[PDB]
Amino acid sequence: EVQLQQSGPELVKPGASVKMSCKTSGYTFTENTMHWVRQSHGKSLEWIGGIYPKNDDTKYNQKFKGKATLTVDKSSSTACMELRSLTSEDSAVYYCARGDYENYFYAMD
Amino acid sequence: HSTQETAIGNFFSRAGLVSIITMPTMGTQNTDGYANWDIDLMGYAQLRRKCELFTYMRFDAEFTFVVAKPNGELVPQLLQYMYVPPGAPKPTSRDSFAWQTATNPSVFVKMTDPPAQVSVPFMSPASAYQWFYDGYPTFGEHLQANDLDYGQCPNNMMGTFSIRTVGTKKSPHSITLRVYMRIKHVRAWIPRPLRNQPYLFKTNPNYKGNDIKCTSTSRDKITTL
Amino acid sequence: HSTQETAIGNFFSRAGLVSIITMPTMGTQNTDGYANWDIDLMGYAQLRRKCELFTYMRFDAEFTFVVAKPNGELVPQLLQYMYVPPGAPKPTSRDSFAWQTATNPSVFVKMTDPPAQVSVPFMSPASAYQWFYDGYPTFGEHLQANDLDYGQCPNNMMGTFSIRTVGTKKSPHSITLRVYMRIKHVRAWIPRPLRNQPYLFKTNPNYKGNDIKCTSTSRDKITTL
Amino acid sequence: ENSNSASEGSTINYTTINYYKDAYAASAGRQDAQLTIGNSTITTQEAANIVIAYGEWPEYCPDTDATAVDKPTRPDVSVNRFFTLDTKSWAKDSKGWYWKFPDVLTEVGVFGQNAQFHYLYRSGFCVHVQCNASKFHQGALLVAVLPEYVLGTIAGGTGNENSHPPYATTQPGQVGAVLTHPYVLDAGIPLSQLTVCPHQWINLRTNNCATIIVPYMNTVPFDSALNHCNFGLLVIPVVPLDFNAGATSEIPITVTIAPMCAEFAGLRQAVKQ
Amino acid sequence: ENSNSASEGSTINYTTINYYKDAYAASAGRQDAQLTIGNSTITTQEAANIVIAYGEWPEYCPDTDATAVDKPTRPDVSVNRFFTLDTKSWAKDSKGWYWKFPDVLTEVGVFGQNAQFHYLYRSGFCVHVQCNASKFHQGALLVAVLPEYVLGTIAGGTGNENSHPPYATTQPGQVGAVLTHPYVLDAGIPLSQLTVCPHQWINLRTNNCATIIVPYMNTVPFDSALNHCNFGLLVIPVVPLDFNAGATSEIPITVTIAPMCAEFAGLRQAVKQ
Amino acid sequence: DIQMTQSPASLSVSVGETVTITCRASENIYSNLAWYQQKQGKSPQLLVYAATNLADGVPSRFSGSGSGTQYSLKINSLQSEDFGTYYCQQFWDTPFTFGSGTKLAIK
Amino acid sequence: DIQMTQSPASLSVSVGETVTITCRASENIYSNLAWYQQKQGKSPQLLVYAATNLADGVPSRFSGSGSGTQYSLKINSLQSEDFGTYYCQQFWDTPFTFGSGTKLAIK
Amino acid sequence: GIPTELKPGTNQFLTTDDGVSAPILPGFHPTPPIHIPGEVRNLLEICRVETILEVNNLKTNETTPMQRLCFPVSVQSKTGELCAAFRADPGRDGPWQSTILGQLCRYYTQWSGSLEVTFMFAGSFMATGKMLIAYTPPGGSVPADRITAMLGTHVIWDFGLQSSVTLVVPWISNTHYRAHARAGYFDYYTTGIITIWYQTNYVVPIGAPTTAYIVALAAAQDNFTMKLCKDTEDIEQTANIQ
Amino acid sequence: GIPTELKPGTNQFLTTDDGVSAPILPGFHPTPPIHIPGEVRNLLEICRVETILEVNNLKTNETTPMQRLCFPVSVQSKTGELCAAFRADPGRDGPWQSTILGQLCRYYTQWSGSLEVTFMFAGSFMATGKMLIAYTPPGGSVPADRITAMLGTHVIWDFGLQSSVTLVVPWISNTHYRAHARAGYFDYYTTGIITIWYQTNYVVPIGAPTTAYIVALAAAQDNFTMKLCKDTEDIEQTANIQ
Amino acid sequence: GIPTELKPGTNQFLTTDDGVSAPILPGFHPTPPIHIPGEVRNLLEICRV
Amino acid sequence: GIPTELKPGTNQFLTTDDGVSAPILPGFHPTPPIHIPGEVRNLLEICRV
Ligand SMILES: CCCCCCCCCCCCC/C=C/[C@H](O)[C@H](N)CO
Ligand SMILES: CCCCCCCCCCCCC/C=C/[C@H](O)[C@H](N)CO
Structure with missing residues (x-):
């Protein structure tokens, strides 16, 4: 009933930038927050940051605050994050999952 | 028949609600236990329509801080409330260095503690406050992007409020704060007509063009009552 | 245009955070319900950079003791806070004899009790405090093992703080204490240039050699703004 | 006890209790002819009593209220004189007109070129509204x-x-602008209460002219002429002009204003806007 | 009420409320020629006004401020005279030099041997910096x-x-030492603000000499000469010397200092360090 | 920043036995727990949230419980499709932190 | 105004299985819950009120439980006459608000 | 220390009560004040200014609000026709809400004093006529004809001579003060009824317009007073100001 | 005992408030004070000392910070070339952060007074030339050429005669006090722009260096005042001091 | 501040006790009184009828 | 009654602080003192032996 489709795998040389995209449907896009999660090896997970897609509301992890940005287009539904100054250990699979109504808590379904 | 009630001292000596600061545990805006609030008197209608009667005003303020949970209950939680003058550091978290209050005034109050009062002097760099400022405080060409700068008096920005739950960890209780203002030692100049239209924004007197309301109440014929 | 604000009295009359004493139930450092704290003003940056403006200073202090749990909650727990002058017994436990306070000043305060204030005079054996002491207080040959003694003024060691939960048994609540200082009746001598580099240690002004920061903010060309 | 309160400048004393060293922390307390010629100009506007706004004539800046160290310029003759702005035309569908001061005179005359070369500004104004009908x-x-x-x-x-x-x-300029909602004055404030401010009624069966002497009203002794507009001038017909066919259909309105006691400070390079 | 507060020594009185018997527990309160010759020495340093540090001449210890029961020694002639230390050499890559006082004079002359035999120390100093260029x-x-x-x-x-x-x-001695980070003065404090302390600029197109009269500055009337160094002397070029080829490449800098009003107490056996 | 540690790291168990995995927080959240199941090369899926209530589409064999800091997850009875890594989350303070993971194999 | 959301929206289950439906409130009422059963073209009927106590004429197969905000309703064991939409109500503050509804079909 | 016992009223916050609080910034001094024209030390100086009263307020004028400030006067076939009638209570819903006195009498409950209502003739110079302007003490309805409106306090005012008239509503009351009258039980404070009658007629020559507009103006006298400060009915906040 | 009622503000701790506390050590007496040179009874005595202003601040000077205290002066092919320009607001990020006045204007928000900027020529004795030193009131940009920089308040200063010049920035303000100007909305407090122009040229004989360095120095006058004490932006503690 | 110790009888409300309370409406003035016949300053004047 | 606000330092017990407490036995009088040799009014008289 709720589908989230991301972009395809991307390869880039160190030092450049990259921008992903997360498109959803099945629910009102402005009423639910979205978060980003990175999975490094083997099972290790981290929390990038959330976004509230009304106008803008942003919360970054203190470690990733400078290495990641979060933008949201409210017309066409998408969630895009941009990374600056990539390096060797920044290569990981990235997740995007919806949050709770008017809340950053109540872990992503 | 004494005129003392009609004096501007007794008319502004009432206390009223300037702003409401909310600091919940779960939510969107402030989840971290700290809330920054920019100083504005225009948030609420009743106290605003008194101050807009006049143009220039010179007064000293007395604030009262009423802390409670949003349902009215009170719990023994410690709180800090500090005043950040313009150009000081604004705390990015509740553990930051800006709370060391080595200069900026701060207050240590509990919830069961009776409310806190402080006397604030007249700090404006001009001789009096002006809520109506006609002009552009900038220079150079004025485009439509910087048009928001109209009616913005740089002399009226007095700082930023700040409040936090005192501690390293997070408190389970959600607090809401209601700040009040009592205008005292007031002087006034150049009275203006009162506003009959509903308020829309804080910074500028915009009125809904389709909602224009006749001040007087209509009747059938002018020869009857 | 009065100069009263720029006086050294009103500049040091603000109150700020000297130290934070933590006394948890579970952990490493203090698990036993007593915490000894050596007296130092150098722990925190804001109050330190004011005192390092000058060289010699003569003042009386007023301390305020804010007790709360690390999450901000308050519980009805009784506490004792005593001052140990240099050379007195330091308590090794909370049941020891040093707490009989037959001489040393002590304070009996609760958590719900409003904070405790005490006036501390100028007890230094010299005429004024000196935060910058150039020399070796010892005698004889100075090797690299005793090199730590550089910049250590024996006149600036005023005692050791001590605090405990009052009782024979252990309390389930973890307490944290924030001590504040208000400098009053202050005199000053020999002003010095302020420190633009970040602080590193408490006892000596070490600066990170690779982190050297230009005081002014850089720009592109000196002929443009 | 030195007075740091906000009422210290007033000449009225109050009885107020204070428990502290700062007076602003105290309580509220109990309370206890003619032929007008600017330099070389003349108008005809009659007669006798005219409205002085707030009962104060335009004057120079007292030495107590001026923080500027530099000595201001006072071009008495070249600045202060009657300036006739653009004429309007009254129509049965007309609403109103508003001018901003000192916007209109920044492009006109020596007064306009000094406001460009100088940073600060102070002046009083004299407003003359001119309308003629049979x-x-x-x-x-x-x-x-x-x-x-x-x-x-x-x-x-x-x-x-x-x-x-x-x-x-x-920033209309000397051409003014028209009001699209005269009832709220496009400020959200009623027209019925507009007479609280200094006003004069021009009634075609009584007087053909109006004169308002406006002092300098600001929270600061000197102000910038380009950025900050002090006060507006509203001409709003309350009763529409009505004339039978065959009479003159075009009834103009002319605004002739003059500065009074203009002081300029902070000489610099020419700045338009 | 006897005054146990910390301001009792000042001559300024304040209005302060106190609810207790101890005055330090009260509130803050509202506030209300020449030819310089030490004994036998001469310099040429010109001219007229020279810098007295903090507007006080070096003098002896007043009887009110001295707690030492013993009678101090005052070797006027043998102690106080110009002492010329080792010369430096300015280079285009140079940074700065710092001397500690009274470190440099502990090994030199009668002043050095008395500081070894005596425990306490008090003196004023006179600093003369010497540089010559065409x-x-x-x-x-x-x-x-x-x-x-x-x-x-x-x-x-x-x-x-x-x-x-x-x-x-x-403890550099009479040979001084060089600064590896002049911008932070190796103290973590800026060079731009260094002029808050007593200073003199030596500019090669104006004056070839500098003189600073330094009084005795300490929290105690007498101090130990070996352990405690009072104040430093910083010579830091702000503008590098630049000369075209063919001129003199070696520009020396000489520091000649003299003590003023030196008192010694606590005679004992010889102690080097 | 609150950290969480799970035990054990790798739990090998056959089909039909009860499995109890734990999650411990440095501070007492009381309100917040989320257990995840990530298969091999697949996206995570939520199982039990708020330390007790099971989410939608989750079978009734999973019962979580706990209070204060220490929490637990009990699986009875284990089936053949339940193998995979498990995680635990806090909602309480930013940043939201995850456990180290627990691999569940077949004995 | 307090709002409530139920999950899931449509739950398809055969006869003889346990069904757990949930109701969540934005604010903590603690005292007030009402579950309804509305058949097709019929008027609603009260099942369990006060989040625990079952009403009159309701069979014993329905056991409600909950506390604070999050609430639940458990049906064991499902019969053939129990299909229909379910609702949840608050008594706490005006206006009284209802859930979005949960359709229960046969698998 | 000093023995002391607390009394009821401890730990209460009364908004109107005048206390003494602690200063936030010791050693502070304000910006030195200057002379700003038009200083208002009391609100009664504002209530004495003359602001436009709206006598014509109808349900057909809401689309064009500017028609509300003036009421017409035309030549009549019958003599003695009633032109305008309205109540004299300033703090009551009606014509008096457009007056600065009316908006400042909303902040105060009780009011006592003599008011004044000034009229202004905007017609032509060749227009001549006289109209009766009357005030009826409470207890009656609108007078049916002019012969019943003469028995009050009336003034005769001529167009061709004076372009303005000042009617002074006397203070007639069974109480020293008066509260704001409204429908139902509080109407016992009703002030009266102010009517305007054609006495002779409105006479126009050839070429001048046959219609004219009169603007109403209202203010207060020297003895007008107010008391018992109060919230106001007019301003309404239904939503947060963004 | 004595009847008493508590008022709001009870049991609050205001850091800035001046109270009276209890003595810890009765019968105590301080160490008797002595005379220490250089006593500072007010901070404005410190703001009046003359400290090095950094006019040259670039992104290429961060590796060698000593190059930041002086800016070069050389012989020019074209006459009237601009040398240095910077803003005059002391409490603003820029050249003024190296001044003891700048670091003490961070602790205070509002400031009013006339400043002074002194220049010192470190070149040779055989170097001759004159340069124009100007101050432009707010509202303009950096003057494009010298013909627009003469219209301000300027001083003409000669190298071969005087080795130092004192430029007094007058106080020109629309307010009695002034807050600290910055980007965006608060820039309405902008003080001005201080420029230095070659008037004639820098003339050097045979054998003397063709380059020269000028050191900038800044201080405050007698009437300089400050108020509204405040936290400072410069000092940053990101971690515990060990 | 001023040292003070509370005594029993704190925080009690005695209905008959004569205290001092805070005014609700500052700057207020009553309606000026007039002469009404038959004023009773003491109840014993009534008991004598 | 008299308006009063409490300040920090309320309800604290400082051992060294000199207060005023309530008498346990009203109307009491001590045993009249006599002359005992060797009275010590200050401890420095002891340090000099
Ligand atoms: C520790 C307590 C915080 C003290 C804060 C004091 C600053 C506020 C004083 C009163 C502010 C003036 C009244 C407000 C008027 C309007 O909102 C301003 N013109 C805003 O533009
Ligand atoms: C019962 C309360 C405890 C009273 C403790 C009083 C002793 C502390 C008084 C103030 C200490 C002087 C300020 C500190 C300066 C620096 O830290 C010292 N130079 C340390 O070397």
């Missing part, structure tokens, strides 16, 4: 002076859109 | 006097290592 016409005008007249928008009419007035609306 | 050279020096000048380290450059300056760095 004894067969009828109508009424309301000429008011509103210190710090803001221009509010309609917020798109739904009220949910944030809109600000453009630069051409807030 | 009219074709250019440059500027900054000669400052910093009371209680600490020497900070670089903490290894990572900042996580605790490092203290060695004995040779903090």
Whole structure:
């Protein structure tokens, strides 16, 4: 009933930038927050940051605050994050999952 | 028949609600236990329509801080409330260095503690406050992007409020704060007509063009009552 | 245009955070319900950079003791806070004899009790405090093992703080204490240039050699703004 | 005890209790001819009593209120004189007109070129509204002076859109501008109460002219001429002119204003806007 | 009520409320020629006005401020005279030099042997900086006097290592030492603000000499000469000397200092360090 | 920043036995727990949230419980499709932190 | 105004299985819950009120439980006459608000 | 220390009560004040200014609000026709809400004093006529004809001579003060009824317009007073100001 | 005992408030004070000392910070070339952060007074030339050429005669006090722009260096005042001091 | 501040006790009184009828 | 009654602070003192032996 489709795998040389995209449907896009999660090896997970897609509301992890940005287009539904100054250990699979109504808590379904 | 009630001292000596600061545990805006609030008197209608009667005003303020949970209950939680003058550091978290209050005034109050009062002097760099400022405080060409700068008096920005739950960890209780203002030692100049239209924004007197309301109440014929 | 604000009295009359004493139930450092704290003003940056403006200073202090749990909650727990002058017994436990306070000043305060204030005079054996002491207080040959003694003024060691939960048994609540200082009746001598580099240690002004920061903010060309 | 309170400048003393060293922390307390010629100019406007705004004549800046170290310039003759602005035309569908001061005179005369070369500004003004009609016409005008007249928008009419007035609306110039909502004065404030400010009624069966002497009203002794507009001038007909066919259909309105006691400071390079 | 407060020594009185018997528990309160010759020495340094540090001439210890019961020694002639220390050499890559007082004179003359035999110490100093260059050279020096000048380290450059300056760095002697980071003065404090302390500029197109009369500055009337160093002397070029090829490449700098009003107490056996 | 540690790291168990995995927080959240199941090369899926209530589409064999800091997850009875790594989350303070993971194999 | 959301929206289950439906409130009422059963073209009927106590004429197969905000309704064991939409109510503050509804079909 | 016992009223916050609080910034001094024209030390100076009263307020004028400030006067076939009638209570819903006195009498409950209502003739110079302007003490309805409106306090005012008239509503009351009258039970404070009658007629020559507009103006006298400060009915906040 | 009622503000701790506390050590007496040179009873005595202003601040000077205290002066092919320009607001990020006045204007928000900027020529004795030193009131940009920089308040200063010049920035303000100007909305407090122009040229004989360095120095006058004490932006503690 | 110790009888409300309370409406003035016949300053004047 | 606000330092017990407490036995009088040799009014008289 709720589908989230991301972009395809991307390869880039160190030092450049990259921008992903997360498109959803099945629910009102402005009423639910979205978060980003990175999975490094083997099972290790981290929390990038959330976004509230009304106008803008942003919360970054203190470690990733400078290495990641979060933008949201409210017309066409998408969630895009941009990374600056990539390096060797920044290569990981990235997740995007919806949050709770008017809340950053109540872990992503 | 004494005129003392009609004096501007007794008319502004009432206390009223300037702003409401909310600091919940779960939510969107402030989840971290700290809330920054920019100083504005225009948030609420009743106290605003008194101050807009006049143009220039010179007064000293007395604030009262009423802390409670949003349902009215009170719990023994410690709180800090500090005043950040313009150009000081604004705390990015509740553990930051800006709370060391080595200069900026701060207050240590509990919830069961009776409310806190402080006397604030007249700090404006001009001789009096002006809520109506006609002009552009900038220079150079004025485009439509910087048009928001109209009616913005740089002399009226007095700082930023700040409040936090005192501690390293997070408190389970959600607090809401209601700040009040009592205008005292007031002087006034150049009275203006009162506003009959509903308020829309804080910074500028915009009125809904389709909602224009006749001040007087209509009747059938002018020869009857 | 009065100069009263720029006086050294009103500049040091603000109150700020000297130290934070933590006394948890579970952990490493203090698990036993007593915490000894050596007296130092150098722990925190804001109050330190004011005192390092000058060289010699003569003042009386007023301390305020804010007790709360690390999450901000308050519980009805009784506490004792005593001052140990240099050379007195330091308590090794909370049941020891040093707490009989037959001489040393002590304070009996609760958590719900409003904070405790005490006036501390100028007890230094010299005429004024000196935060910058150039020399070796010892005698004889100075090797690299005793090199730590550089910049250590024996006149600036005023005692050791001590605090405990009052009782024979252990309390389930973890307490944290924030001590504040208000400098009053202050005199000053020999002003010095302020420190633009970040602080590193408490006892000596070490600066990170690779982190050297230009005081002014850089720009592109000196002929443009 | 030195007085740091906010009432210290007043000459009225109050009985107030204070438990501290700062007086602003105390309580509220119990309370206890003619032939007008600017330099070389003449008008005909009659007669006798004219309105002085707030009972104060325009004067220079007292030495107690001036913080500027530099010595201001006082071009008495070249600055202060009657300046006739552009004429309007009254119509049966007309609404009103508003001028901003000192916007209109920045492009005109020596007064305009000194306001460009100088940073600060202080002056008083003299406003003369001019309207002529025969004894067969009828109508009424309301000429008011509103210190710090803001221009509010309609917020798109739904009220949910944030809109600000453009630069051409807030800086009209000597050509003025027309009001689209005279009842709220485009400020959200009623026209019925407009007479609280200094006003004169122009009634076509009584007087053909109006004169308002406006002092300098600001929170600061000197102000910038380009950025900050002090007060507006509103000419709003309350009663529409009505004339039978065959009479003169075009009834003009002329605004002739003059500065009074203009002081300029902070000489610099020419700055237009 | 006897005054036990910390302000009792000042001559200024305040209005302060006190609810107790101890005055330190009260509130803050509202506030209300020449030819200089030491004994037998002469310099040429010109001219007229020279800098007295903090507007006080070196004098003896008043009887009110001295707690020592013993009678101090005052070797007027043998102690107080110009002492010429080792000369330096200015280079285009040079940074600065710092001397500690009274470190330099402990090994020199009668003043050095009395500081060894005696425990306490008090004196004033007179600093003379000497530099010579032709009219074709250019440059500027900054000669400052910093009371209680600490020497900070670089903490290894990572900042996580605790490092203290060695004995040779903090006790240079008459040979001085060079600064590796003039911008922070190796104290973590800026050079731009160094002029807050007593200073004189040596500019090669104006004056070839500098003189600073330094009084005795300490929290105690008498101090130990071996352990405690009072103030430092910083000569840091702000503007590098630049000269075209063919001129004199070696420009020396000479420091000639003299004690003033030296009192010694606590006679004992000889102690080197 | 609150950290969480799970035990054990790798739990090998056959089909039909009860499995109890734990999650411990440095501070007492009381309100917040989320257990995840990530198969091999697949996206995570939520199982039990708020330390007790099971989410939608989750079978009734999973019962979580706990209070204060220490929490637990009990699986009875284990089936053949339940193998995979498990995680635990806090909602309480930013940043939201995850456990180290627990691999569940077949004995 | 307090709002409530139920999950899931449509739950398809055969006869003889346990069904757990949930109701969540934005604010903590503690005292007030009402579950309804509305058949097709019929008027609603009260099942369990006060989040625990079952009403009159309701069979014993329905056991409601909950506390604070999050609430639940458990049906064991499902019969053939129990299909229909379910609702949840608050008594706490005006206006009284209802859930979005949960359709229960046969698998 | 000093023995003391607390009394009821401890730990209460009364908004109107005048206390003494602690200063936030010791050693502070304000910006030195200057002379700003038009200082208002009391609100009664504002209530004495003359602002436009709206006698014509109808349900057909809401689309064009500017028609609300003036009421017409025309030549009549019958003599003695009633032109305008309205109540004299300033703090009551009606014509008096457009007056600065009316908006400042909303902040105060009780009011006592003599008011003044000024009229202004905007017609032509060749227009001549006289109209009767009357005030009826409470207890009656609108007078049916002019012969019943003469028995009050009336003034005769001529167009061709004076272009303005000042009617002074006397203070007639059974109480020293008066509260704001409204429908139902509080109407016992009703002030009266102010009517305007054609006495002779409105006479116009050839070429001048046959219609005319009169603007109403209202203010207060020297003895007008107010008391018992109060919230106001007019301003309404239904939503947060953004 | 004595009847008493508590008022709001009870049991609050205001850091800035001046109270009276209890003595810890009765019968105590301080160490008797002595005379220490250089006593500072007010901070404005410190703001009046003359400290090095950094006019040359670039992104290429961060590796060698000593190059930041002086800016070069050389012989020019074209006459009237601009040398240095910077803003005059002391409490603003820029050249003024190296001044003891700048670091003490961070602790205070509002400031009013006339400043002074002194220049010192470190070149040779045979170097001759004159340069124009100007101050432009707010509202303009950096003057494009010298013909627009003469219209301000300027001083003409000669190298071969005087080795130092004192430029007094007058106080020109629309307010009695002034806050600290910055980007965006608060820039309405902008003080001005201080420029230095070659008037004639820098003339050097045979054998003397063709380059020269000028050191900038800044201080405050007698009437300089400050108020509204405040936290400072410069000092940053991101971690515990060990 | 001023040292003070509370005594029993704190925080009690005695209905008959004569205290001092806070005014609700500052700057207020009553309606000026007039002469009404038959004023009773003491109840014993009534008991004598 | 008299308006009063409490300040920090309320309800604290400082051992060294000199207060005023309530008498346990009203109307009491001590045993009249006599002359005992060797009275010590200050401890420095002891340090000099
Ligand atoms: C520790 C307590 C915080 C003290 C804060 C004091 C600053 C506020 C004093 C009163 C502010 C003036 C009244 C407000 C008027 C309008 O909102 C301003 N013109 C805003 O533009
Ligand atoms: C019962 C309360 C405890 C009272 C403790 C009083 C002793 C502390 C008084 C103030 C200490 C002087 C300020 C500190 C300066 C620096 O830290 C010292 N130079 C340390 O070397």
